[PDB]
Amino acid sequence: YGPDQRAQKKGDIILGGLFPIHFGVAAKDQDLKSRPESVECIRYNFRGFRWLQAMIFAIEEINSSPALLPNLTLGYRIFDTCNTVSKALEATLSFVAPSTIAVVGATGSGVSTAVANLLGLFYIPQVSYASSSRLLSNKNQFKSFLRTIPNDEHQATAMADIIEYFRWNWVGTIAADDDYGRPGIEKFREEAEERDICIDFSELISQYSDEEEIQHVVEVIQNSTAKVIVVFSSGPDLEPLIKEIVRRNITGKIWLASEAWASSSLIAMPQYFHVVGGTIGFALKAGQIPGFREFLKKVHPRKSVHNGFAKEFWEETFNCHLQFRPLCTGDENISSVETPYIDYTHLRISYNVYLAVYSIAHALQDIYTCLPGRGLFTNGSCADIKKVEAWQVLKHLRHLNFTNNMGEQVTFDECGDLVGNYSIINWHLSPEDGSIVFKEVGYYNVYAKKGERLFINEEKILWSGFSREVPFSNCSRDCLAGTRKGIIEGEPTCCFECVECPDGEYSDETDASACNKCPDDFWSNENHTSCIAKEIEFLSWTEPFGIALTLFAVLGIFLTAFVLGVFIKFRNTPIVKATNRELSYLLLFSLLCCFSSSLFFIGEPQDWTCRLRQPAFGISFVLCISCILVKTNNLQFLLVFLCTFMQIVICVIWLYTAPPSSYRNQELEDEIIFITCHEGSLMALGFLIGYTCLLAAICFFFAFKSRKLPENFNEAKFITFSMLIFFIVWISFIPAYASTYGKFVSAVEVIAILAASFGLLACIFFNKIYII
Amino acid sequence: YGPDQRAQKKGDIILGGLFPIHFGVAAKDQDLKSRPESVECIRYNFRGFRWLQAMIFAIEEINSSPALLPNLTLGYRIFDTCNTVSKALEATLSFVAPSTIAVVGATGSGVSTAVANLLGLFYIPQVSYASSSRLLSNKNQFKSFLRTIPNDEHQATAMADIIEYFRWNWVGTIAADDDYGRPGIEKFREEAEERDICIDFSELISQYSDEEEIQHVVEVIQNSTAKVIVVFSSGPDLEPLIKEIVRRNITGKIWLASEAWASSSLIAMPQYFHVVGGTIGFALKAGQIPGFREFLKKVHPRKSVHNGFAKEFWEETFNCHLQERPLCTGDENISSVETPYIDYTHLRISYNVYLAVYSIAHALQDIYTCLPGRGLFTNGSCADIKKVEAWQVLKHLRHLNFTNNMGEQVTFDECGDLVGNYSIINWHLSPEDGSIVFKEVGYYNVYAKKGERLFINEEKILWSGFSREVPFSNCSRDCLAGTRKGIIEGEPTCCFECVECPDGEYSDETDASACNKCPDDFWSNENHTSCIAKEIEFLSWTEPFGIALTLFAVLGIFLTAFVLGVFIKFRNTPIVKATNRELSYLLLFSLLCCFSSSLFFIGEPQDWTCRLRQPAFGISFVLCISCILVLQFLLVFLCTFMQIVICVIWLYTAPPSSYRNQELEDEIIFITCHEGSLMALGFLIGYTCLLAAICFFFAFKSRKLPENFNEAKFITFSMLIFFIVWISFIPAYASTYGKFVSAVEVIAILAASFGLLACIFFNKIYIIL
Ligand SMILES: CN1CCC[C@@H](NCCc2nsc3ccccc23)c2ccccc21
Ligand SMILES: CN1CCC[C@@H](NCCc2nsc3ccccc23)c2ccccc21
Ligand SMILES: N[C@@H](Cc1c[nH]c2ccccc12)C(=O)O
Ligand SMILES: N[C@@H](Cc1c[nH]c2ccccc12)C(=O)O
Ligand SMILES: *[C@@H]1O[C@H](CO)[C@@H](O)[C@H](O)[C@H]1NC(C)=O
Ligand SMILES: *[C@@H]1O[C@H](CO)[C@@H](O)[C@H](O)[C@H]1NC(C)=O
Ligand SMILES: *[C@@H]1O[C@H](CO)[C@@H](O)[C@H](O)[C@H]1NC(C)=O
Ligand SMILES: *[C@@H]1O[C@H](CO)[C@@H](O)[C@H](O)[C@H]1NC(C)=O
Ligand SMILES: *[C@@H]1O[C@H](CO)[C@@H](O)[C@H](O)[C@H]1NC(C)=O
Ligand SMILES: [Ca+2]
Ligand SMILES: [Ca+2]
Ligand SMILES: [Ca+2]
Ligand SMILES: [Ca+2]
Ligand SMILES: [Ca+2]
Ligand SMILES: [Ca+2]
Ligand SMILES: [Ca+2]
Ligand SMILES: [Ca+2]
């Protein structure tokens, strides 16, 4: 039963094996018009043949070594798969129909699942060397499946770890449509969604995809703008897409390869290097087998009776025919042909096959060496090596713990899986022969804490095979300090737009999603990067004008004092005696008060300065005018007292019913703030000005009626002149009072006060001073 | 050999069958201390037994029919699977080892794939009735698989269509870990991502899941705000999670069920209604098989000798034992016990099994009725019905075309697939008994273009089983008008925040991603939904201030006209002749011009007004001053002509123009005029002031002379008035910007003109009249 081509040997215990000597079957359309015939597989697999030789070498070495299973020999029964489920099921049917003790598993995950479904019925243990699908770790469906290779969850996590380490957020994914790529892509999608990474496209490929599908995938890749692509597939399934992309000449992409095709000879070609240069992928850990290469080099089509594949091996290696293609003898050298059969650098799957073979032998030895009364079966008994059975071997494999030739313990967990380290490689170009050379740049440690597993040597990486600069795989560029992030409808969060912050607000981050606002008494600078303090505007003594306006007030004070001194010294003189001396003294004191009252309008407006800035001039000028109207021909003193008392009443009631107070205003201009004080009540100020103007008008009329008189050196005309200039300077500033609101309101008030005081002093006293 | 429990009959052609008589197997895991034994099955499946009976009915009816396969008989060989791959693989090994022609497929997708992997080796056709996975459409790996049920791509598309129809963007997903749930969830994820729908979580379940996994899934469900959950699984896989959720009393969720568990009896139970009420799911199209209920109701443990499952059927129906718990006598009635065996409303998978049996039976008739020379094989030949083979039956099934018992046409496409309509159902509570009722609320057409496939009646839906209001699942409330969207870091694009638009911008529609700016003459209102026109400020005729100034101007003009009229009405008296008669006419004409020149400062400043605003007053006042300054006509003409030169040079070099100011306040437009060359205006001011100054000096040096009513005193008075009014204007010009600068100009002009006229002419006009 089974195919004609096989490798067979006899022994006390027989082992099974399945290896992919071919890459795939011949593609054709079978119309059911004639009886269907057997399908043939086409291309050859030197790597699979090397795996088969590794298994045979392990079995033969175990037989030769007398320290393991004495007085007992092992045989084998090995078939070919051509990487197809149908071919592997024919061989498996002959395994369960001599009986096999255990089978060394297949390569593909789907083939392994199909074989294990049949193998688990009879409880025949199956140890695989290359199937890493997470679906095979379910022990409810696969009762007797073990493997020497770890599952792909760690690799899928490592891919996301690498992507996060190189700071990318815009990637695409491609997977093969089988039991190996889909769960891996699902796990990677979960991890990437956890790590805040956006995925643009996701596609499925196959070895038997057609022209429309390949062109659609190529157009999707071409139209996409992401530059990093994660591929979870194998070489036979990835070849057509690579061929089409090479034909279309698409460059500038970054490939993240899984372990299946990170070292495949189908893709690593010099012709394709200009599209797949700089690939970063994963590799397992290499082992050491001493005499393996010597065992490999000794194959021969005539000296290998047990091996049936050696004939076609010779045919494919030497392009000949064994008794158009010529006739080749049996005298050639396999060390002069460039084939992957012996052109290897590390052994990984070969070491997996070695370990999978040795595990069964160790379990058999454990069965053989049992001491009665301390076994694992029923009431402490154990099996017998004369008629041992598959379920007993499976139990002992489930309870196995041994150390290998290198010195590491081998143990299978509850799910029958091992644990192992990963390595990271980079594709380069050989300067001598042009071949692709795999250069190690990092590793992945699975015994470390989360977030401490990845190590990357950045300086040893060429990115497209010729570049030393890390690529750019962001959807959009980063925002600046003065801008914030926007929203583009119909796009993921990884893509946005930068919008400048509005006036009065600032931002200081390169990825800010909003604009900040530092607190009051502050404003945002011109480009809204930082917020600066506001400026306070007010006329103070420091203000240049303030110092000029103070120079003037003290000049007036000094002039009044000098006039008073000249008057008091010459009191008895008839010129002074003509006027009332006490009235002159009171008038000069009131002029002193008027010149002093202008010094309250300058400076910081404290709550008391603005309380008395106005009445200090109002009362003084009222007293001046009242004394002036008196000095014209003591009752007059009491009339003066009445005139001052009337103003005192309204001033006191105003200050006691609605005091004026300081005020900081931030409304006229946003960037600057003012300090100006309102009057509280406006009726009081209006009435003050009205009473002052009423007394002024009364004095003006009274001095107008008696204008034409020469008494007192024509005082009654200079009085009218003084009243006229007072009225003119009061009228001239009404628009300034009613319109502006800055520091110019204070300065004009001081100017008017000084003008009125100076005119009132000069017009009255200059004539008498110039003659005394 | 095969399992002892089976159903068997003999005929010319033997058919195969696989049905799930049991829900599963016992979870007793051996420790390999002793030799392993056969595993047993736990629960009974009346629906599976009915499915099994349908095939036997179809075969019996075919054998009874005399016009379909005369002189031929059909046998069968049916086994149990217990929904397990291992049990179904044991039966399949007996099929390929007295040779079957075709096998009626299994129920589960994984079991179907496992059976097809072995059945394709020998090219034995296999027609399934319930496996709808899209992985079975691959003809490069399944060379002999056909099905009477459509695949799940249409259902996955319809789920996203329903979600878009009910306007949701915040959902969760739950799937079974097998070949039925994962591809469906993948296709649904693709469709939902294409349709702009955000998915919160995604979890996997299984029939043999453990306590910690179930609690983790429950916590993941409970910690989210998404209310709509899409489930692609079956009842046996869903039961533990539903039981745990019922135990923890989680309510308020909306379930979207796939066709596998949308009618499962394991989930649709009264005790779980408070959790799974108001479920919306899919269903296939029902069929009609006459004489089928009568065939179903005739089962008996003794009369049915070919069937071997009848004894266990009886024991599970009546809960007793059979002699070969009480003892079953064997005379009870099936209609007196309520089990899903005969308590049904529609036949869908039973009709699928019937269709598969008849599809197998028609290819044999096609082989039998061929004509030599025109055949489906080499050289136009055909086979022999006495030695027909599986590959020939497969060919004739691949080239099959026949009419149903209703009248529709049955053909298998290049992938051995069918297409069919979908039905949409809702879960309710029956007030009569309390059972769950599946109420039809819509359908899903497949013979239509994209976008016109789904019909839903919303008025027939109860939400959570008791409500008539469409639920809410957003992750964010809608942003209103005048408000903008905002990014939340670390969250999907479906969750955002609302931010108000700034000053000067607006937004009208809802869910706006940006605020639009307003045109150059509009400004946003307080609510920032739309902007309004800016206000334009300038002195106007309608404004009362302008009307007052206009009234003053016309009064002055009329007074000047009256003065001139009285002057001309007394042309012979010597009082007028004492002064220059002709020069006074020029003086009064210049006075009229000066009065009239004050109407160019009122109104909206146009281009032509601002060009001749200033020169009119300048020329008029120079005329007046030069006339007062004094042969005499020559002197005044040459003195006043020099200003026309600078006026025309100004108006030819840099004419002033109107200007709209939008830089002082952002909500107010100030329309003023700029002079341009300030040097020309300064020169006009200087020339006028210098002429006034020389006139004032000449009149001041000779005040005392009473030549004619002391005219020198009045001339000096007028000059002083002019100089005083054109000094009082300085603060208003300096710090009263706006519409108040134009007013003080008019006031000063009118005051100066009135002072001049009153000083010069009134006294003489009072003496004359
Ligand atoms: C009491 N006071 C002090 C000296 C300046 C002047 N006060 C002018 C204030 C003012 N007038 S109108 C207006 C509109 C808004 C704001 C302020 C004003 C004055 C003149 C004569 C007599 C007393 C006084
Ligand atoms: C040409 N013009 C006609 C319009 C009115 C006025 N325009 C000048 C306004 C002005 N701006 S600053 C200044 C400083 C002192 C005086 C005025 C001004 C004016 C006045 C006197 C003579 C001629 C004219
Ligand atoms: N892990 C792959 C098989 C595989 C591993 N390494 C390989 C190298 C070459 C070819 C195939 C492989 C699978 O499960 O399908
Ligand atoms: N379609 C499901 C099987 C199925 C369909 N309808 C059902 C009803 C009950 C149980 C199972 C089913 C699958 O492929 O796995
Ligand atoms: C396996 O055996 C070695 C050698 O005795 C021992 O050191 C180790 O602890 C064992 N491991 C386990 C997991 O039992
Ligand atoms: C894996 O790598 C880490 C770090 O290099 C190392 O410490 C550890 O021993 C490795 N594990 C094995 C099994 O070699
Ligand atoms: C790409 O995006 C990541 C994640 O947001 C960010 O840290 C990184 O700076 C971006 N790259 C560049 C070049 O801006
Ligand atoms: C099947 O038969 C019908 C009825 O004769 C015919 O119209 C149709 O073209 C045939 N083929 C298909 C694929 O339906
Ligand atoms: C599906 O329904 C539509 C109407 O919704 C009908 O025209 C069509 O015939 C139906 N298809 C089948 C196969 O019954
Ligand atoms: Ca030995
Ligand atoms: Ca394989
Ligand atoms: Ca996150
Ligand atoms: Ca390879
Ligand atoms: Ca989109
Ligand atoms: Ca018949
Ligand atoms: Ca089944
Ligand atoms: Ca059911």
XYZ file of N, CA and C in Angstrom, chain B residues 9 19 35 48 78 88 177 216-217 324 336 338 365 369 441 458 497 572 574 576 604 614 623 633 643 693 725 749:
84
model
N -29.833 -0.186 4.702
C -30.737 -0.868 3.788
C -29.948 -1.262 2.549
N -25.216 12.583 10.131
C -26.106 13.480 10.851
C -25.684 13.567 12.310
N -5.493 1.290 28.957
C -5.708 1.373 27.519
C -6.927 2.243 27.224
N -31.574 16.849 14.643
C -30.726 15.967 13.858
C -31.437 14.694 13.440
N -26.117 5.277 6.950
C -26.096 6.529 7.695
C -25.500 6.280 9.075
N -16.865 11.195 13.133
C -17.223 11.211 11.721
C -16.138 10.602 10.844
N -14.375 29.685 17.761
C -13.031 29.326 17.306
C -13.095 28.049 16.467
N -13.173 36.254 31.837
C -12.454 37.308 31.130
C -13.301 37.895 30.007
N -13.978 37.036 29.241
C -14.855 37.525 28.180
C -15.992 38.352 28.770
N -34.873 -5.967 25.875
C -34.431 -6.634 24.655
C -34.260 -8.132 24.880
N -48.046 13.522 22.090
C -48.331 13.916 23.462
C -47.104 14.440 24.199
N -43.818 17.234 23.889
C -43.375 18.432 23.176
C -41.853 18.418 23.082
N -30.369 9.425 -13.595
C -31.308 9.398 -14.712
C -30.691 10.012 -15.960
N -30.492 7.915 -19.460
C -31.259 8.320 -20.631
C -30.396 8.937 -21.728
N -39.564 40.164 10.133
C -39.618 41.622 10.087
C -38.927 42.154 8.837
N -39.436 48.588 10.561
C -39.050 48.973 11.915
C -40.219 48.889 12.888
N -14.735 65.073 20.952
C -15.268 66.065 21.873
C -15.646 67.316 21.091
N -27.618 154.316 -3.263
C -27.408 155.746 -3.455
C -27.035 156.488 -2.180
N -24.819 157.562 1.025
C -23.353 157.652 1.087
C -22.704 156.724 2.101
N -22.857 153.374 2.263
C -22.229 152.290 1.510
C -21.075 152.821 0.670
N -21.580 110.412 3.429
C -20.588 109.369 3.198
C -19.490 109.908 2.289
N -11.067 120.589 1.325
C -10.235 121.643 1.902
C -10.031 122.860 0.993
N -9.683 134.657 -0.137
C -10.400 135.750 -0.789
C -10.882 136.773 0.231
N -8.183 145.828 -6.525
C -8.658 144.617 -7.189
C -7.496 143.810 -7.751
N -2.765 130.579 -4.437
C -3.225 129.362 -3.777
C -3.884 128.397 -4.755
N -2.413 136.818 9.594
C -1.501 137.487 10.516
C -1.109 138.871 10.015
N -10.814 130.160 17.388
C -11.531 128.951 16.990
C -10.602 127.961 16.303
N -15.705 126.110 11.131
C -15.950 126.862 9.902
C -17.122 127.817 10.090
